[PDB]
Symmetry: D2
Amino acid sequence: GITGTWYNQLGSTFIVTAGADGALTGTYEAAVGNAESRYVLTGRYDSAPATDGSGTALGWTVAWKNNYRNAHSATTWSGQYVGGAEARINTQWLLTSGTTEANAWKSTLVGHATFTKV
Amino acid sequence: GITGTWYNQLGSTFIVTAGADGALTGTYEAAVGNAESRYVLTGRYDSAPATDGSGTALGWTVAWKNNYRNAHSATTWSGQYVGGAEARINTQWLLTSGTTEANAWKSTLVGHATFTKV
Amino acid sequence: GITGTWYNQLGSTFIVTAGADGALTGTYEAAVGNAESRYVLTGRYDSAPATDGSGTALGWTVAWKNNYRNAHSATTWSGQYVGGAEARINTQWLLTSGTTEANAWKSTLVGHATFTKV
Amino acid sequence: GITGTWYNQLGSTFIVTAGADGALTGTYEAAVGNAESRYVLTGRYDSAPATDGSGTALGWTVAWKNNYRNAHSATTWSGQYVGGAEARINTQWLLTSGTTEANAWKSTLVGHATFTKVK
Ligand SMILES: O=C(O)CCCC[C@@H]1SC[C@@H]2NC(=O)N[C@@H]21
Ligand SMILES: O=C(O)CCCC[C@@H]1SC[C@@H]2NC(=O)N[C@@H]21
Ligand SMILES: O=C(O)CCCC[C@@H]1SC[C@@H]2NC(=O)N[C@@H]21
Ligand SMILES: O=C(O)CCCC[C@@H]1SC[C@@H]2NC(=O)N[C@@H]21
């Protein structure tokens, strides 16, 4: 259920393939941020999630460099997939920019996002 | 550089190879939590960091499933490499557990960790 | 705007008073977690907000001790009030438990919540 | 135990009084950030902690407005006090700026800070 195209409320587009092994592979297109076009993403997910009614833990990273720009920054999303008619991926993310040590205290933004199929 | 074997204050072991395309690949061994032995990790880093003195942004993900057990959870570390005194990776992390919907509100732990090579 | 009774998605109840000097006071009632009935809260808000459509920064804290039980934990919410149309308060929160040193790595939960008066 | 002057690595200084009922009151002096002079802080702490060696949960807020300036932003620190020979306050913090709706995605910084009785 994770492989495919997912959207967040901010207008970004996450295209993923979930390998049989636990790999997450794909591209991210950010609607906001110092970004343009697609960026490589790589991640991991629980390929044998709980057999009750729990989501599927996952995580992925995008470093914000591609052929057109480099934002000298990296976002990790940590969350879980919840399947069904309104499948979704509920995440929290951390966006760290490379900084001088004097500015390291403000290197990291924190946010959250729910991704959907529509 | 970032390729190498790194350790945090807890004694976990992070073994990573940074590839030229921006890929991070390796294994992670947790000194605490619902884990044993090594776990696959994958992530991304800025392959062309600023020369201005800033760190190098990166992130990586561990899904806490391997051959011996499955914690149904995933941690992402978001941070920057500092090829500084000791070189170090300063991170913040998010550990998300697959939960039921009623428990999603407590799905995610947050913490921070500095890794060094000794 | 801020002064009022607010609810989050979890159905918890946030009853707050904004004093004219930047003080937030009131009670919090959690619908989930190791809590029951009302808990004291206190916090601070920007009493002279930007007047450029920006939100009103604020935060508040609940220590989860009251006459009925004590969870030995405390949550802080950090967010901004957005007035107008449908007023809401958008937050991120940090729930820290008193733990031993060895368990401090898992002492803190993070989440997010939007409060509305509906 | 918590009452007194506390220092972090950034050079900021936090003065706090822990009330018997659980209130935290005082001022925070930041040494980095869009900040000058002292700022009011208020918060709460577990005033009947575990005696088992476990830390004392607590949190506080600073709205970064005082008589000298206004950063239109607020920080909350969430953490636990650990007493002893080497007392400290182990925290994580969220600093939220007021922002337009379209900028909300980047409204909040996250960080961590250990406070000590000695600089
Ligand atoms: O601005 C940068 O440093 C690079 C672009 C970051 C875009 C962020 S990642 C979190 C949020 N969700 C998105 O889809 N875009 C932003
Ligand atoms: O869900 C679990 O218990 C497995 C998580 C593994 C341990 C966590 S990840 C963050 C922190 N750093 C470590 O080295 N271990 C813990
Ligand atoms: O369980 C505890 O340690 C004390 C109660 C904490 C409840 C949390 S605070 C964040 C979230 N929002 C709520 O309304 N309840 C939970
Ligand atoms: O810049 C602002 O928006 C107001 C001041 C922010 C200062 C931050 S709060 C977290 C960290 N700890 C400090 O002592 N200063 C910074």
